[PDB]
């Protein structure tokens, strides 16, 4: 058995991580105190769930995770929340004043002082792994700590863990839920210094999750709770193959979804998202939920995949799904949808079925469904997300607005244009592969 | 108070739409770089579709469908017809065409020669025409003319038996304007135009191309009978309908319109799942200029489709007001249609 | 624990600061003696930000009262909430500043500053993590103007990486004590351009006009004007004193409101402003129109005469957050020309559930607009009208200053105006 | 329409369907980037204090 360490950084990463590990416990039947009756091997074992939980002599199942935040208000919640008993103090690291939405402040000014401590805590978890695979880094693009400290932590991880894989879960900044005006700067600053160090990154545009909540769940003004409870579903389905007996290792994600290194930004699609407040709903068939994977209204990032080209497609089914129905819907959808693959890649689908249906948080917003499917697709149409941001970046940088706050922390103005020239190349790389 | 922007100062059609929108007092124009707009009258090339539909609380509408260039590019249309089953390579209303790449760059050179040699052997007419978005009966001249250029070209069968108007013995083409709204209703402007030739058609001299090309700019520059029979070499559906009755004893609706309406439907329905803005975070609408040819058997042929067409000087007011009524006002309501809806299955 | 150290200097400073502590003390359920008596825990969630906790569950405002004459601070100590203030935090002399910036900054004030900083340091040494400082004062006097800017300069030296925001009352020709106020305001502004992160410009003429034309007060008073400054000071701090998804510290706020270092001057606004029809419920739209109306703004500047760099709206009350989002999104599209298009999403909104005392719901407006230059032009105009003839200069040259320092403060504020001008285009 | 590598077990199964065939910086350097930034912070704060002593 091979272990996986999760690293949550910033407000967004911590709260999302709190929602994920909640779902993980409900899925593996772990109680808030850390006990697991179904686990008969007490104090040890190399099972499918042990890739994410460790076991103590007392039978406590402990997450292989670390929480980092330059401010103690967000992580204090975890220290007194329902699942306080799961983690031990070493796993929760906090400073005393945040990065004030300033990438430089998180990367250079504050990061420098707390970087060697985090690595040492991570080393403590690594010293418990018999065959460590890599890390799952949850963070936000707009946060100063989420963008600033993550980029530094990645650079040091590629040094202390050369051969290990690293996957990001990045939160794309959306104005409807953000009061920050500089998140474009931070996003482009962090995707630049983090590119060469991340092997596969799933972006979640808060704009997408927001409309999915208002439209499918009839929530007029959704909260971060409502947003995270959903994201963790998508994260759970993407990580389910590492915790359960279905297809398996973090190396597969890059091999299966990232042919070209820089283009490591897959697009996620999840369905069905049904409101628990709904009296009762027609249980969507495999064809219907599979046909939903090609409606943009179910994508973690709003974009048009009909005007890009695909490089890969996985279909992660959870629930009552059998191969015969998957192929039936697939042939049905090919003759109806616009799906253009690149000529250097085959036109097919990798499919994984997990029979245990998606678990839902009691009293939560998501209705229990009998079969759910999350599709991971590497489209060039996700380059729209880079164009959107790179434009905003250009609008402000032209007037050098807000640049002094960064230079004030020791960063040089050139790192802006340098990071922007990198995003201009990354936009060119997508157009080369997707347009004729 | 709705807001809109203008990113194509050369558009004669939407220069009037913006003029009408402002005249309503309920629309306000912003600078061309301000993103808080309900509507965008965007640029022809490299329109930034990826930046639309991401402004909270703003229903955004654009005047171009993303993906319609498959239908308006010479080399793109040929590819869409032969490769789309809804149209098939056996499409009966589109001239036998081939996509030829200059030898300095798939390509249908060998497939073209095979069909060319077949005609030459069967004593059939074999006058083709080469053109590009950027006439000869000999295959060597057509292929050599393309090599002398550096962009994609298309060789399609030249209609050697075109319907000729009298008096004059002249050729012509028909321009129909089709408006597609966000819901994807297909409205045909009841008013069409015939861009005619003022020179007697001559089948023994394709060298002088003034009697073979019915473009409005070529006639007003190289033709010596410009404006003789009709003003500006433009005849409208009323006169052309009357001539058909006197000469051929039929109507424009039966003889030509029915086929045109079918061609319009067939093309837009073919690419509907590929450009439809039904479940999209923004909405699209576009005005199309369809160019038709009519042979001596009263069969209607498709020439090309223009994605950014101009309009006849006399029809700018009526057509533009209809755009505002059914395309813009239908999405942003203010405080007998001139179009013919082409019902269909979505 | 993100503590904030409060300072109030001069007559105006202390009087305004006093009413401020009166206003938030009531909101946080703290009575005149320092005991807690609220019915909700939101009142204590962030109480340490502006209050220290003493023995017996007492809450002592972290406010340092400073003045050169004792007159005003004796009023505060005998005021409604007077006894709440730490007796040691009263730092005052006897000479007074004579409404002379030089005296407060160079001579009379110089003799008292070190004792004030001793108190500031004492408060800082007990702050688990100091957020920053806030100063209340006028710019037309001598103490809060002359010594207040002197304090600020000495605080930035000892705490260079701490946020320094101020509430500054601009002198107007309509509500004027002395003719030398243009001299004092101009000299203070130069200091504020260099050493403050947020400066809320409060024009007395604006407060007056609001109390006269809107509130229907025939004869407004310094006490009437200050009530408005209490409500506004309480509004712009709600995101700091109460819990919400906003979170944010003094530094996170500045980063998002100040795109250029020396353009950190805001025009605040409050709403509603109702005359005694005073019990009528106010809908979410009515709060918003007035809030963006110029008559409800306190800088005597017409926003339609400039462009907004950034804008922040803080709502308080039990209202529809969905409907809130809807109305804010509506105003910007109605008046797009008055917002710069090169700062994406430069209008932010926050919601709080605790309304001010007696109001079902209120709205506090914070505006970083380029129209604020008109406030500085008025000051610079009056300044030069006097300085060209060296009128009343002897009151300053006598205290040790040279004509050169006046010519510098002149040029520095005229540059500030040009800076505001370039971005308006 | 070819299904391949059909993998089955008790908790689920996995397979592949094909429709058509085809056609770093060292720790030394990082410490320098960090210190160089801390050095520009020291020089900017120095210039501030120098202007303040003046
Ligand atoms: N989906 C989701 N997004 C969040 C959440 N919390 C914050 N965000 C987003 O994160 C962005 C801001 O970054 P934060 O994570 O809050 O800041 P930070 O990482 O704590 O770094 P600091 O600035 O030092 O506090 C905003 O655009 C928010 O939309 C969350 O719980 N869920
Ligand atoms: N196969 C063919 N047979 C007969 N005539 C043809 C033809 N192909 C083109 N033409 C002539 O060419 C003219 C149109 O040329 P084409 O449309 O390809 O160029 P263009 O796009 O610059 C003009 P527009 O865009 O306004 O329709 C028509 O008037 C038609 O008479
Ligand atoms: N709004 C308001 N303004 C005041 C008050 N007291 C003084 N001012 C203004 O402050 C200026 C005089 O400053 P003052 O407080 O006397 O200076 P000091 O010597 O520092 O106390 C004048 O322009 C007044 O308009 C007050 O209580 N409220
Ligand atoms: C003490 C000194 O400043 C304050 C309040 N600052 C403040 N900045 C803000 C920026 C955006 C929104 C509200 C804000 N409020 C209290
Ligand atoms: Ca076990
Ligand atoms: Ca690596
Ligand atoms: Ca003395
Ligand atoms: Mg934080
Ligand atoms: Mg053309
Ligand atoms: Mg006085």
| Chain D partners within 8 Å of C156 (Cβ) | 52
Query: CB of C204 closer than 6 A to ligand 3?
Result: yes
Q: Could you say which of A97, A168, A183, A252 is catalytic?
A: A252
- For residue C128, report the distance from its CA to the centre of ligand 8, in Å: 17
B154 lines ligand 2 (CB under 6 A): no
Q: Is B67 in Cβ contact with A306 (below 8 Å)?
A: yes
Place of tokens 């592949």: D16
Do C256 and A404 make contact, defined as CB atoms within 8 angstroms?
Answer: no
3-state secondary structure of B180: strand
Instruction: State residue C202 phi and psi, 5-degree precision.
Output: -125, 105
Is residue C358 marked as binding? no
Number of Cβ within 10 Å of residue D7's Cβ equals 14
Contacts of A73 in chain C (CB under 8 A): 247
Nearest chain C Cα to B58, which residue? C329
> Measured at the alpha carbon of residue C369, what is the angle toward residues C295 and A141, in degrees to the nearest 5?
125
Q: Is C168 annotated in some ligand binding site? A: no
If we measure between CA atoms, which residue out of A401, A407, A14, A393 comes closest to residue A186? A393
Phi, psi torsion values for A235, nearest 5 degrees:
-65, -45
Give the β-pairing of C361-369 and C308-317: antiparallel
| H or E element, residue A172 | strand A165-172
Measured in Å, residue A56 CA sits from the centre of ligand 5 at 9
Q: Which atom of ligand 2 is nearest to the CA of B128?
A: 1
Q: Do C19 and C72 form a contact (C-beta atoms < 8 A)? A: no
d(CA A158, CA C410): 55
- Pairing mode of beta strands B61-62, B39-41: parallel
Shortest Cα distance, chain B CAs vs residue C294, angstroms: 21
- Nearest CA of chain A to the CA of B346: how many Å? 12
C contacts of B57 (beta carbons < 8 Å): 325-326, 329-330
Q: B8: domain range?
A: 2-68
User: Is C342–A399 a contact, with Cβ atoms under 8 angstroms apart?
Assistant: yes
A43 C-beta neighbours (distance < 10 Å), count: 11
* SS3 state at B291: strand
Smallest Cβ–Cβ distance between A304 and the set B48, B51, B66 belongs to B66
Question: CATH number for the domain including B9?
Answer: 3.40.50.11480
Flag whether residue C261 sits within 8 Å of chain D, measured between CB atoms. no
Beta-sheet strands, E only, within C340-412: 347-352, 361-369
Question: Is residue A71 marked as binding?
Answer: yes
Closest ligand 2 atom to the C-alpha of B156?
1
Please give the biggest Cα pair distance in chain B: 68
CA C9 – CA C145 distance, rounded (Å): 8
Helices (H) and strands (E) in chain B, counts: 11, 15
**What DSSP element (H or E) covers B252?**
helix B252-252
Structure tokens at B210: 């003034």
Judged by 3 or more CB pairs under 8 A, whether A touches D is yes
Among A372, A371, A323, CA closest to A349: A323
Nearest residue, CB atoms, C329 vs list B1, B33, B57 = B57
Cβ within 8 Å, pair C157-D52: yes
Q: Is C239 in the pocket of ligand 4 (CB under 6 A)?
A: yes
Buried b (16+ CB within 10 A) or exposed e, C285-314: eebbebbbebebbbbbbebeebbbbbbbbb
Domains of chain C by residue range? 1-259, 260-371, 372-425
How far the first Cα of chain B sits from its last, in Å, is 33
Whether the CB-CB separation of C76 and C82 falls below 8 Å is answered with yes
Query: Nearest C-alpha to atom 10 of ligand 2 is from which residue?
Result: B213
B50 in C contact zone (CB under 8 Å): no
C160 touches chain D (CB under 8 A): yes
Report the chain C residue with the minimal C-alpha distance to residue D44: C160
- CA-based R_g, chain C, Å: 21
Q: Is C169 in the pocket of ligand 3 (CB under 6 A)?
A: yes
From chain B, the residues in CB contact with A176 under 8 A are: 56
Q: Which residue of B has its CA nearest to C325?
A: B57
Distance CA D47, CA A102 (A): 22
Q: What is the distance between the alpha carbons of residues A77 and A67, in angstroms, rounded to a whole number?
A: 12
Which of C138, C208, C300 has most ligand 3 atoms within 8 Å of its beta carbon, as the pocket-test mutant? Answer: C138
State the chains in contact with A (3 or more Cβ–Cβ pairs under 8 Å). B, C, D
Structure tokens at B312: 């006849």
Q: Is C142 annotated as a binding residue?
A: yes
Q: How far D40 CA lies from chain A's nearest CA (Å)? A: 5
Contact D34 A112 (CB under 8 A): yes
B39 lines ligand 2 (CB under 6 A): no
| A44 assigned binding-site residue | no
Q: A113 in contact with D at a CB cutoff of 8 Å?
A: no
For residue A194, say whether it is annotated as part of any ligand binding site.
no
Tell me the Ramachandran region of residue B180: left when phi exceeds 0, alpha when psi lies from -120 to 50, beta otherwise.
beta
> Structure resolution in Å?
3.1
Q: Is the CB of C3 under 6 A from ligand 4?
A: no
Report which ligand 2 atom has the smallest distance to the Cα of B195. 29
- Specify whether the CB–CB gap between C208 and C220 falls below 8 A: yes
C97 CB within 6 A, ligand 3:
yes
Which numbered ligand comes closest to the C-alpha of C143? 3
A344 contacts in chain D (CB < 8 Å)? 22-23
Helix (H) or strand (E) holding A126: helix A111-126
CA angle A303, A305, A306 (to 5 degrees): 125
Q: Are A213 and A1 in contact (CB under 8 A)?
A: no
DSSP state letter for A357: P
Q: Which chains touch C (3 or more CB pairs under 8 A)?
A: A, B, D
A418 is catalytic: no
Task: Please state whether beta strands A61-63 and A53-55 pair in parallel, antiparallel, or not at all (unpaired).
Answer: antiparallel
Contact A78, A67 (CB under 8 A): yes
Q: Is C69 in the pocket of ligand 3 (CB under 6 A)?
A: no
CA atoms of C50 and C43, how far apart (whole Å): 12
C184 is in an annotated binding site: no
DSSP H or E segment with residue B16: helix B12-23
Chain C partners within 8 Å of D49 (Cβ):
157, 160
Q: Residue for token digits 């995770």?
A: A65
Sign, CA torsion B224/B230/B231/B235: negative
Using CA atoms, how far apart are residues C331 and C340, in angstroms rounded to an integer? Answer: 14
| Strand runs labelled E in C273-385 | 308-317, 347-352, 361-369
Strand pairing partners for C67?
Answer: C92
Mind telling me how many Å the CA of C179 is from chain A's nearest CA?
38
Q: Exposure pattern of A189-221 as b/e (b: 16+ CB <10 Å)?
A: bbbbbbbebbbbbbbbbbbbbbbbbbebbebeb
Residue pair C267/C299 in contact (Cβ under 8 Å)? The answer is: yes
CA of B30 to the centre of ligand 8 (A): 37
B5-11's contacts with Cβ under 8 Å and 24+ in sequence apart are: B5/B29, B5/B30, B5/B31, B5/B32, B5/B34, B5/B37, B5/B39, B5/B40, B5/B41, B6/B32, B6/B41, B7/B32, B7/B40, B7/B41, B7/B42, B7/B43, B7/B47, B8/B41, B8/B42, B8/B43, B8/B44, B11/B41, B11/B308
Neighbours of B221 (CB within 10 A): 10
Residue A90 CA to residue A66 CA, distance in Å, equals 8
Pocket, ligand 1, Cβ cutoff 6 A: A 10-12, 15-16, 69-71, 98-101, 106, 140, 142-146, 171, 173, 177-178, 180, 183, 206, 224, 227-228, 231
Element (H, E) at C265: strand C265-271
Cα A423 to averaged position of ligand 1 atoms, centre (Å): 22
SS3 B314: helix
First to last CA, chain C: 42
């Amino acid at each position: 058995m091979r272990e996986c360490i999760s690293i949550h950084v910033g407000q967004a990463g911590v709260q999302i991580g709190n929602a994920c590990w909640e779902l993980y416990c409900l899925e593996h039947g772990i109680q808030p105190d850390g006990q697991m009756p179904s686990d008969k091997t007490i104090g040890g074992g190399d099972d499918s769930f042990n890739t994410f939980f460790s076991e103590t002599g007392a039978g406590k199942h402990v997450p292989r995770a670390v929480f980092v935040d330059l401010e103690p208000t967000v992580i204090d919640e975890v220290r007194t929340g329902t699942y306080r008993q799961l983690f031990h103090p070493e796993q929760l690291i906090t400073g005393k004043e945040d990065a004030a939405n300033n990438y430089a402040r998180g990367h250079y000014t504050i990061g420098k002082e707390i970087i060697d401590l985090v690595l040492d805590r991570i080393r403590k978890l690594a010293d418990q792994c018999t065959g460590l695979q890599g890390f799952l880094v949850f963070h936000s693009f707009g946060g100063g700590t989420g963008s600033g400290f993550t980029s530094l932590l990645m650079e040091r991880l590629s040094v202390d863990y050369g051969k290990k894989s690293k996957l990001e879960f990045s939160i794309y900044p959306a104005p409807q839920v953000s009061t920050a005006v500089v998140e474009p700067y931070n996003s482009i600053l962090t995707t630049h210094t983090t590119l060469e160090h991340s092997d596969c990154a799933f972006m979640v545009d808060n704009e997408a999750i927001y409309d999915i909540c208002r439209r499918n769940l009839d929530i007029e003004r959704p909260t971060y709770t409502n947003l995270n409870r959903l994201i963790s579903q998508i994260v759970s389905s993407i990580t389910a193959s590492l915790r359960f007996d279905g297809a398996v290792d973090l190396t597969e994600f890059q091999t299966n979804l990232v042919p070209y290194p820089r283009i490591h930004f897959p697009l996620a699609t999840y369905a069905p998202v049904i409101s628990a407040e709904k009296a009762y709903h027609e249980q969507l068939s495999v064809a219907e939920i599979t046909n939903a994977c090609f409606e943009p209204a179910n994508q973690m990032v709003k974009c048009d995949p009909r005007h890009g080209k695909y490089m890969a497609c996985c279909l992660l089914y959870r629930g009552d799904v059998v191969p015969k129905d998957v192929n039936a819907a697939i042939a049905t959808i090919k003759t109806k949808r616009s799906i253009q693959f690149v000529d250097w890649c085959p036109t097919g689908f990798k499919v994984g079925i997990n029979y245990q249906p998606p678990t839902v948080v009691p009293g939560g917003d998501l209705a229990k469904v009998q079969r759910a499917v999350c599709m991971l697709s590497n489209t060039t149409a996700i380059a729209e997300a880079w164009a959107r941001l790179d434009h905003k970046f250009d609008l402000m940088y032209a007037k050098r607005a807000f640049v002094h706050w960064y230079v004030g922390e020791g960063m040089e103005e050139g790192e802006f244009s340098e990071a922007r020239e990198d995003m201009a190349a990354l936009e060119k790389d997508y157009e080369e592969v997707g347009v004729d | 108070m709705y807001t809109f922007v203008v990113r194509d100062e050369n558009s004669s059609v939407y220069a009037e739409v913006s003029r009408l929108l402002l005249a309503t007092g309920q629309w306000k124009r912003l600078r061309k770089d301000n993103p808080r707009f309900n509507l965008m009258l965007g640029e022809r090339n490299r329109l930034p579709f990826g930046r639309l539909g991401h402004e909270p609380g703003l229903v955004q509408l654009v005047n171009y469908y993303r993906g319609a260039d498959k239908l308006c590019r010479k080399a793109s249309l040929v590819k869409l017809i032969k490769t789309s089953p809804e149209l098939s390579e056996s499409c009966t209303w589109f001239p036998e065409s081939y996509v030829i790449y200059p030898t300095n760059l798939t390509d249908e050179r060998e497939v073209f020669l095979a069909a060319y040699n077949r005609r030459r052997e069967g004593r059939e007419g074999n006058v083709w025409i080469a053109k590009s978005s950027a006439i000869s009966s000999e295959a060597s001249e057509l292929l050599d003319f393309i090599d002398e250029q550096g962009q994609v070209h298309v060789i399609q069968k030249y209609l050697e038996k075109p319907l000729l108007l009298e008096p004059g013995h002249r050729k012509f083409d028909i321009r129909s304007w089709v408006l597609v709204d966000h819901l994807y209703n297909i409205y045909l402007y009841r008013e069409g135009v015939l861009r005619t030739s003022s020179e007697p058609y001559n089948s023994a001299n394709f060298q002088d191309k003034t009697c073979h090309l019915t473009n409005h700019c070529i006639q007003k520059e190289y033709s010596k009978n410009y404006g003789r029979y009709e003003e500006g070499n433009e005849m409208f559906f009323e006169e052309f309908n009357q001539y058909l009755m006197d000469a051929l004893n039929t109507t424009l609706e039966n003889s030509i319109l029915l086929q045109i309406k079918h061609i319009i439907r067939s093309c837009l329905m073919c690419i509907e799942p590929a450009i439809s803005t039904k479940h999209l975070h923004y909405q699209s609408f576009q005005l199309f200029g369809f160019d038709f040819m009519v042979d001596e058997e009263l069969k209607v042929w498709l020439i090309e489709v223009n994605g950014a067409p101009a309009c006849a000087q006399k029809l700018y007011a009526e057509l533009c007001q209809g755009i505002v009524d059914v395309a813009i006002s239908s999405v942003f309501p203010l405080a007998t249609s001139i179009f013919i809806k082409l019902h269909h299955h979505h | 624990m993100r503590e904030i150290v409060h300072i109030q200097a001069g007559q105006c400073g202390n009087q305004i600061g006093a009413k401020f502590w009166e206003v938030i003390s009531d909101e946080h359920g703290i009575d005149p003696t320092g005991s807690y008596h609220g019915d909700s825990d939101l009142q204590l969630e962030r109480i340490n930000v502006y209050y220290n906790e003493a023995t017996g569950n007492k809450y002592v405002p972290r406010a340092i009262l400073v003045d050169l004459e004792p007159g005003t601070m004796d009023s505060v100590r005998s005021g409604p909430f007077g006894q709440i203030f730490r007796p040691d935090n009263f730092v005052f002399g006897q000479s007074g500043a004579g409404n002379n910036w030089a005296k407060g900054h160079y001579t009379e004030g110089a003799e008292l500053v070190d004792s004030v900083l001793d108190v500031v340091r004492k408060e800082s040494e007990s702050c688990d993590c100091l957020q920053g400082f806030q100063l209340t004062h006028s710019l037309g006097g001598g103490t809060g103007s002359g010594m207040g800017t002197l304090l600020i300069s000495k605080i930035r030296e000892e705490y260079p990486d701490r946020i320094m925001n101020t509430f500054s009352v601009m002198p107007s020709p309509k509500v004027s004590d002395t003719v030398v106020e243009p001299y004092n305001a101009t000299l203070s502004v130069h200091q504020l351009v260099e050493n403050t992160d947020e400066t809320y410009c409060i024009d007395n003429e604006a407060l007056y006009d609001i109390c006269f034309r809107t509130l229907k007060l025939t004869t407004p008073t310094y006490g009437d004007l200050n009530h408005l400054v209490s409500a506004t000071m309480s509004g712009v701090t709600t995101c700091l004193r109460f819990p919400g998804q906003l979170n944010a510290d003094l530094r996170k706020l500045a980063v998002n409101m100040v795109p250029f270092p020396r353009l950190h001057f805001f025009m605040p606004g409050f709403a509603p402003l109702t005359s005694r029809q005073q019990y009528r419920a106010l809908t979410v739209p009515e709060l918003t129109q007035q809030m963006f109306d110029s008559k409800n703004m306190m800088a005597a500047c017409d926003p339609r005469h400039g462009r907004y760099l950034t804008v922040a709206a803080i709502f308080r009350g039990r209202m529809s957050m969905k409907e809130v989002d809807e109305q804010m999104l509506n105003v910007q599209n109605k008046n797009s020309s008055y917002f710069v298009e090169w700062i994406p999403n430069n209008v932010k909104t926050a919601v709080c559930d605790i309304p001010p005392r007696g109001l079902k719901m209120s709205a506090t407006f914070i505006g970083n607009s380029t129209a604020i230059q008109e406030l500085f032009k008025r000051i610079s105009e009056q300044f030069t009208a006097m300085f060209r003839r060296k009128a009343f200069l002897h009151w300053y040259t006598g205290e040790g200053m040279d004509e050169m320092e006046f010519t510098e403060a002149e040029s520095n504020m005229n540059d500030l105006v040009s800076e505001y001008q370039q971005y308006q285009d | 329409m070819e299904v391949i590598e059909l993998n089955k077990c008790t908790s689920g199964q996995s397979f592949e369907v094909i429709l058509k065939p085809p056609s770093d910086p060292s720790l030394e350097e990082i410490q320098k980037k960090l210190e160089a930034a801390e050095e520009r912070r020291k020089y900017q704060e120095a210039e501030l204090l120098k202007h303040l002593a003046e």
